[PDB]
Amino acid sequence: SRRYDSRTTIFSPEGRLYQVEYAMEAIGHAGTCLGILANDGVLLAAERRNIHKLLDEVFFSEKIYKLNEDMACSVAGITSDANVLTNELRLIAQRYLLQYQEPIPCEQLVTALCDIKQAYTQFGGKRPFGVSLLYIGWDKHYGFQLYQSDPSGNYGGWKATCIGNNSAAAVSMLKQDYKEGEMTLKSALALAIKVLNKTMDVSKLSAEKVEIATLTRENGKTVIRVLKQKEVEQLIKKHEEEEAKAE
Amino acid sequence: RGSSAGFDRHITIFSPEGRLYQVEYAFKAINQGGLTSVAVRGKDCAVIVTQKKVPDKLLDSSTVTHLFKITENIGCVMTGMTADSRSQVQRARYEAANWKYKYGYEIPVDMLCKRIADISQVYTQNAEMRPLGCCMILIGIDEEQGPQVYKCDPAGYYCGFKATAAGVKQTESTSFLEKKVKKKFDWTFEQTVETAITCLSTVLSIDFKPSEIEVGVVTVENPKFRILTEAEIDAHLVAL
Amino acid sequence: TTIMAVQFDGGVVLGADSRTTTGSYIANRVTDKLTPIHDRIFCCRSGSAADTQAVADAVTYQLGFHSIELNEPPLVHTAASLFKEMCYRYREDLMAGIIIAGWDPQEGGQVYSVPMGGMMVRQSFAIGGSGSSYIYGYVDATYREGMTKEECLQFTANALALAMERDGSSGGVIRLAAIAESGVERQVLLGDQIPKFAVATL
Amino acid sequence: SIMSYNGGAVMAMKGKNCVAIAADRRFGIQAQMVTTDFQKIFPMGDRLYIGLAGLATDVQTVAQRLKFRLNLYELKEGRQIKPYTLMSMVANLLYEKRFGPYYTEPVIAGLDPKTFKPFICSLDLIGCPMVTDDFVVSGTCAEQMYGMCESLWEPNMDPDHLFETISQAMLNAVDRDAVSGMGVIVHIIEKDKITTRTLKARMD
Amino acid sequence: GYDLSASTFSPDGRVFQVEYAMKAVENSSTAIGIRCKDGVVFGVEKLVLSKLYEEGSNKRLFNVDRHVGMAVAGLLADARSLADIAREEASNFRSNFGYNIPLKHLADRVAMYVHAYTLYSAVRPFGCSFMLGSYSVNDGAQLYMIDPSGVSYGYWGCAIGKARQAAKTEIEKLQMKEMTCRDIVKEVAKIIYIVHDEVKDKAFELELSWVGELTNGRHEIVPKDIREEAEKYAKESLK
Amino acid sequence: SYDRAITVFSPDGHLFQVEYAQEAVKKGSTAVGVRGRDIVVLGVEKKSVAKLQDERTVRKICALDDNVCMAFAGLTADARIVINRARVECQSHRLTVEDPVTVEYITRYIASLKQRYTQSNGRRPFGISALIVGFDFDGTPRLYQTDPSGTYHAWKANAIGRGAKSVREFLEKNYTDEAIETDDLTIKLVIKALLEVVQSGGKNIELAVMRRDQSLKILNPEEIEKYVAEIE
Amino acid sequence: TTIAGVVYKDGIVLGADTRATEGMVVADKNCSKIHFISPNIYCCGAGTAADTDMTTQLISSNLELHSLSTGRLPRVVTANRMLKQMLFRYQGYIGAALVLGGVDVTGPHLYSIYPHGSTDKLPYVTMGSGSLAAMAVFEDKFRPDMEEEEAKNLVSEAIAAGIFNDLGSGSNIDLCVISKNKLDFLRPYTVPNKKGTRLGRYRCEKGTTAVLTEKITPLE
Amino acid sequence: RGYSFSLTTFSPSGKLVQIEYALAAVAGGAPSVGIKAANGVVLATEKKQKSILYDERSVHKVEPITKHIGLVYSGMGPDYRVLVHRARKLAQQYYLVYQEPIPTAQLVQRVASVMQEYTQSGGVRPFGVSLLICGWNEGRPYLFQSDPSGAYFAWKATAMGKNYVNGKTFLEKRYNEDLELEDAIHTAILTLKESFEGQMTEDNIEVGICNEAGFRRLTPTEVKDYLAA
Amino acid sequence: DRGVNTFSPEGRLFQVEYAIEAIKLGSTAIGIQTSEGVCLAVEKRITSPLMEPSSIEKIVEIDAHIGCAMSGLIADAKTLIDKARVETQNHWFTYNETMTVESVTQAVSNLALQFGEEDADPGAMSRPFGVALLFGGVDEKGPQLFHMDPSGTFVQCDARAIGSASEGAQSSLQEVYHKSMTLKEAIKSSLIILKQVMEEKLNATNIELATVQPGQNFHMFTKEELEEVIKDI
């Protein structure tokens, strides 16, 4: 029926897609998630939203969702639509392995999800996935990589980027304290906590409000390791003290 | 009170207070027929009694009925839109025969009201279709649980009852007949028919004739669903 | 298998053996090949047991749903038509030789044989099964128009006993069923209740 | 007999707190070998291996269809699979194409990832699971190593006795089979380590 | 805006697209049918619009099976559609059960086809009521009528059309339960002429069809020798 | 299946969704292609460099085949569907013809696909234009431009994206046989046209040149500043 | 394969062997051929063992759907009719040869279910390749309404008659007693025959097998 | 023929308002409380029928999925049942593949993925149902909440329904991490007492527990024993 | 607000009524049927000087004996003139004869009004075609010329102008046409009328001319051939 339809996949008279641009504002009030590329790894630093006192600790993370042996993602937006996307990336990552017996290159996995995301913005009459989501990974062709994928279906490779709440303030801080070709992993963990203080409105960090995962190579095998609570509490205290030695 | 924003008035989507504004209108569609059905279960019996308004002299009154025989052992009374009524009866008669074909035993009243209500939920969640403006009251005798009186509604809610009413005087005959679920058992024997008739007689203030109502019974001694004849109803109507 | 139905004035008398063979091994010797399709309509099943049990369950579903809509006890011709439409659509898949007998208030005790292929004829008596071939001369010799209920019970028993004697695929007990206006009176003839016939001497 | 096209022989044996799995190395056509390094044992876990014999296109296909489904399983369920559950995963995979079956009869062998309880299994070509506590065989020389492992197997073997048993039962079977041989690889799966020994066999 | 679809109730629980579709029947001329002791007699006041139409165009009495007839009233293209539906149901019954379809069952199979278009926005309700009538030796005379909502009731007399209420009063004073079919035809033609307006709608051709015991249960048009002997009888009591 | 007419006609005979998809092209980054004698040069105008792009994967000059490469302007995600479906058709054409495509063939495939979503049910038009450059087997250079309407034309020089009304006014007064003579002078004709549109200025463009066999290569950032210093 | 069932006074006794052959060579010494369907219905399985696994597991899951939907104990006529309507649908191409049996609220019921989809409700049935040996014991010694001890001794004598007479049966006797109250799934009810005692010892010493290469990868 | 367009779309503020309105259907429902103890999870809800005529032993709000997973709702009654019969079907589709009882987290991931689909598929409204789902797998107790969006959350203890915000503050005071199951049933009943409006009896509530013996809902004889304390 | 298959109160079927208004924005095309051949002449409407004018193919071959002239939305024509070309080859495949000019017009105009949005196909037209087509060729009946309005209404014309300046060029075609003029006099008459109606200066770059004779096939004029005709005007 034409009366009840909302026309989710039409153009604005200015040339815009409303439901895409309205899905972009669902993400700007989601959990702040950032990613930093280093010379020996890529990290993810998601600000945890579900920080209630009566929550349990079931499965490995809250907003990471490892995709592959060699690459993981991190989501911000609609929590439920991200679970549908991350099952789909795991299928694409395993259909490439079934078809080629090599792990999926990370740019080819982001491209294939962004084709599914574009297809809901052009035909079908459905709402788009209100999930922008980061990507960290390793592959043979370019090594460590970092991607971001908006609900429009367009993606980009980044050295440092941020999605979620206060992403615009987080990007500008990553424009100045990031150095290209000069970031180690331990330097990038400290840059992650530095950005997650001026972009979270609370007084400080406590490591129950963040989740960090790093991706490195160890003897020819990619390891994806969510940092534990004490490993981030040492990084918070290494920045909560060093800020006192700079004023 | 009740807010509204969008097409909450027309399709089964949520009101801003989450009400299903369109499903609540199918309950108003039950009162459009102007009729009231009363159901009550005893200890060894379950009785349905409904009004029989043949408003035209030229109607064949043998066809003007709201009692329906779903299986040999399950009876029905319908209240609401009479065309939506007959559709849900044929779907209940069909779903009760697939049970016997697939599972080899007669369907309970438990699982026939559950399946018909699961059909009615689909109408309340798909926008392409309206709910059926009618409610079904099923009676029967289970093996272990005994007499059962179950009613499904246009929302998809199918709860079990000691005694049910439906239609126009539903609230006046639930508030009445819940006072007879007092000290023991609403006279839980074969003259729960007299409980069913005087409930419908009070809220209508009618003091019915022999052929102004129609009565359907099940019993434990007779688990088959029977429709009482007007000579059998007048044997009960003259007793009160 | 040896199945049989004889019509009398006021109802029908059914009859079957009880032997199901898997080759020349008797897999079951107490089968009930008289499947009730409704309250006054049975069928007798000959042929593939997986085929005749699936057709009889399908028609019991189709006839019981037919009677619940029409609010009338169904016709024996209506039941036999549902068997005919079943095993004519699927005549190259369903090896099922059926005979339908029953009683209805309209036209009384009726017998319909639906053999393999899916034709349907009303007959005053009909036999079917592998052992039916052995008693065509006997049922054509001593059938008489106007037998009573107990006179058709003796006739169906004598014809099934003569076919159980000559067929390896027939045996066990004789299952009789008399369907009338009042109801169904089933009985099992076992052991020394099967009619005995003399073999030659010397 | 289409499962004798490429030949092959896989055998898995249970010990005390350790399992062993073994296969031959021959890839072949009806009587012609092509390589002597053909993989028939695949790592379906930390300490859990599947071994596939039969038609070599299905030895490669089913091992890739299982690696497809197991990596979906290990990402979604967030844990490693238990060896009983892999058995039901293979039994679903082989039965889903029942009419027109995968011509492989796989054996699995592994340790319970939280008990270290030994587990060996064998499946038919349409996925009928066989859990035993002694030994499972599969391949062209099944009868050669049924009777060979009926004599040499002892209950509660050490890992060093288990290696000397499964390797004397593979060598004596595939040297009595024409289309099996060209080497034997053996995996001893224990709680602390996986030891893999290829061993000197007759190359005829 | 509670009346643009059949999948929408009103706030007082009414489906207006069904109730608008029965205004279309009320804008059609009156067709009556009377069930008597020997059978069922139909009668249609068939308004002939132009003089240019042939006598028999836009026929309102249908044969849906060889024992069942159908008098329609309303949107005529929808009526010929449902006549084909009632023919298919009567055909499929004999191809699946082997005997003539009962009028109770045929009326319920067609009314549930009409009801199926009162539920969705993808379709509209039918713009026609229609009576069905048959005779059997076993089942006797039967007359059912199906509304655009899809409700089917049995009648001794139904009077769908413009002058619905005015014709029901003429059928109610008739005592059809003891009268024979050749006496009802003389009365159906009386009721058609007394409800016809000789001012608003000018020209009209009477169509009559029985089904009864005198035809061995076949439905057919009343012959012109009996039709003209009832139109003459109807004008003589119209005065 | 969602079957609803999205692109419909309006009074005065306009397709609004086609017109509104062309407004999505005018909000995109500016792409310029000119056609020389034995050289075709595509250049896009990177709006922001931001010092944090991995610039390898936001390049707006793709490569359809070995002889055909295109540059787009508009919705970047809609282009990647068009770029990939043109690459499949360039390989099906080698499968059935045993020859590389002509530049007008894959332009007809892209334009008829772009027309198809302006007339099919349940689809919006592509919000892209495409400057397609290439070489025939004869060696004639080609330059084409598709629109969201599905219309395609050949061009000596063309510009799509934002500011393209001013870049095309530039190229219509500076495209001659003398500026299209040297292969290096043809490359500076795109860079001079882009620097009229880049409102921040500098070496913030991307540009790819395709000559004949020994085919397409995208120019490096310091290899582009050598031309911008030669036009300072 | 030798599977059997019987109906005693107030319950039902199922029995099976434990041999699974890959042709004429014994694969499984200890195959479990009595299968769970519901807490009151088990099913013995013969014929194609992969078919009887993947058929009884589906009817068990369908009755797990059906039971806690209805909220009551399932019936044996329901398990029959799911089985026979599925096996008729595949037209005998799946070889499920079944001795469905159990006790519902209507009593003890036992069915034999043939792979083409025919069923039969008897007080005693046997199926399998050693079924004809096991019917000979039941046609000899069955009487109606026996005790549990009399009926377990009869099914175990019938399964053992299939064991010692059929080449495709042996190695153990499984029992399953189902009554209105209890559920006795007796997995080695009888060991009629065991392996002979090895008179020698053939264990190889460490070093008897030559190796070519050797990898050791330790585990975390 | 079925509508093929999403009835849930993004609002200009970036919100899926049909999901946000289906949460309002949940927050008007009857209160449901789940508490994960150290050896069990208790699920309790207010089963308060409208009249005396309603059979309390007829329909159930605490429903078992498997032998080891049960769940309870706040929100709409009939939308729960379509969702609780698919949950019972997803649990057996796992069991046919893996021959292992389904993990409680994996059932919640499959149920919430269904509930996500009716926020994006054509012509359907979301469910007006939240779910407290319990289960015992791998020696650990589990408690999950499945929101109408399709998002799931593991909870130590939480509450839905009417006065859920007042009730969830009551959980944060009287929840010890090292309780037993028998001490968590009393604290779950007390949360249903913090907003009940009446005198709660054995028929006015419904309690379901899940320990290592599996899932079961408590008999009304067993509910009366816990109401004495 | 309203669907694509909706009649006006005047009974005009709105979307076709607006697809006719789309043609009045396209360039002017002229056809003249003489007894010695038909001629098809169209304005190219050069937008930019950098646009190569050899790509503005507003006249196409349908078969060797039929050529078509289009105006309106040129992208919409390419699905109609490809269905025109396949239908002539399917007619040649089955019947070994050239298809007549009327029946190619009849087959293409059956695709007009074959749109909708209610299960008309899995891939169906959402909207009508925004084109008018002038088919012109020589069949066994001789030279013929047909018009193909978006309503699927096809009509044989002796002379017909379509496009933005049709009302005013059709007034000029009715004055100068007669039933015995020559193809040389029709080519020349199709350019005096293009001179009245074009905005730019008429040269051999911004026009496109093609004729179909009974002897020769369809052919389109070259740059050298058009220069002779423009000097005669």
Short mmCIF file of C-alpha atoms in Angstrom, two decimals, chain D residues 46-47 95 98-99 124 126-132 135 143 146 150-154 160-161 163-165 167-168 171 189-201 203, chain G residues 20 22 24-30 48-55 57 90 93-95 195 198 202-220:
data_model
loop_
_atom_site.label_atom_id
_atom_site.label_comp_id
_atom_site.label_asym_id
_atom_site.label_seq_id
_atom_site.Cartn_x
_atom_site.Cartn_y
_atom_site.Cartn_z
CA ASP D 46 43.56 -27.46 19.60
CA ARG D 47 43.77 -31.15 20.45
CA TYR D 95 23.63 -37.01 5.91
CA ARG D 98 22.54 -38.63 1.65
CA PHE D 99 21.27 -39.43 -1.82
CA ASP D 124 29.98 -44.07 7.65
CA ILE D 126 26.17 -41.04 5.19
CA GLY D 127 27.09 -40.19 8.78
CA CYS D 128 26.40 -43.02 11.20
CA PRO D 129 28.54 -42.27 14.28
CA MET D 130 30.53 -45.01 16.01
CA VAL D 131 32.03 -44.16 19.39
CA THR D 132 34.43 -46.84 20.61
CA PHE D 135 40.11 -48.20 18.06
CA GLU D 143 39.87 -55.71 7.37
CA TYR D 146 40.59 -54.50 12.15
CA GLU D 150 42.29 -56.48 17.67
CA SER D 151 45.57 -58.07 18.71
CA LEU D 152 47.88 -55.16 19.44
CA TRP D 153 45.55 -52.85 21.34
CA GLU D 154 45.78 -52.94 25.12
CA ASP D 160 54.91 -44.23 24.06
CA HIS D 161 53.13 -47.59 23.97
CA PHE D 163 52.69 -44.78 19.31
CA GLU D 164 54.34 -48.18 19.01
CA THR D 165 50.93 -49.85 18.71
CA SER D 167 52.34 -47.52 14.02
CA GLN D 168 52.80 -51.28 13.99
CA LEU D 171 52.51 -50.51 8.72
CA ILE D 189 47.48 -36.19 20.82
CA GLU D 190 48.26 -35.71 24.51
CA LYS D 191 47.24 -32.99 26.95
CA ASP D 192 50.51 -31.02 26.84
CA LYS D 193 51.71 -31.58 23.27
CA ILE D 194 50.88 -32.92 19.82
CA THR D 195 53.69 -35.10 18.50
CA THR D 196 53.69 -35.80 14.76
CA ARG D 197 55.96 -38.50 13.34
CA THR D 198 56.09 -39.65 9.77
CA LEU D 199 57.71 -43.03 9.71
CA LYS D 200 59.70 -45.30 7.45
CA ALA D 201 57.40 -47.36 5.27
CA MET D 203 57.42 -47.14 -0.94
CA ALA G 20 27.02 -53.26 13.67
CA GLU G 22 30.13 -53.14 7.57
CA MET G 24 30.31 -59.22 6.72
CA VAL G 25 32.94 -57.67 9.01
CA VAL G 26 32.04 -56.40 12.48
CA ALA G 27 32.52 -52.66 12.94
CA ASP G 28 30.96 -51.91 16.34
CA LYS G 29 31.10 -54.31 19.27
CA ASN G 30 28.86 -52.05 21.33
CA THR G 48 20.19 -48.70 7.66
CA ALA G 49 21.67 -47.42 10.91
CA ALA G 50 22.31 -43.90 9.63
CA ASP G 51 18.67 -43.74 8.57
CA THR G 52 17.41 -44.94 11.95
CA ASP G 53 19.64 -42.43 13.71
CA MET G 54 18.56 -39.44 11.68
CA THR G 55 14.89 -40.50 11.73
CA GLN G 57 16.33 -38.11 16.35
CA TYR G 90 10.38 -40.88 1.26
CA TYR G 93 14.38 -44.75 0.28
CA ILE G 94 15.30 -44.26 3.95
CA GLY G 95 15.56 -47.62 5.65
CA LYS G 195 36.47 -62.08 23.81
CA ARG G 198 45.10 -63.57 24.77
CA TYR G 202 52.68 -58.79 21.23
CA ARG G 203 53.47 -55.34 22.64
CA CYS G 204 56.31 -53.62 20.81
CA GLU G 205 59.14 -51.98 22.70
CA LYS G 206 59.87 -48.27 22.44
CA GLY G 207 62.04 -48.12 19.34
CA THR G 208 60.57 -51.07 17.44
CA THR G 209 59.04 -48.67 14.90
CA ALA G 210 61.49 -46.64 12.85
CA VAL G 211 60.57 -43.02 12.18
CA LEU G 212 61.68 -40.63 9.45
CA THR G 213 60.90 -37.15 10.83
CA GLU G 214 59.36 -36.00 14.09
CA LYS G 215 57.59 -32.79 15.11
CA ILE G 216 56.56 -31.87 18.64
CA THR G 217 54.31 -28.85 19.17
CA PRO G 218 53.49 -28.19 22.84
CA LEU G 219 50.11 -26.87 23.90
CA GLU G 220 49.24 -24.00 26.22
#
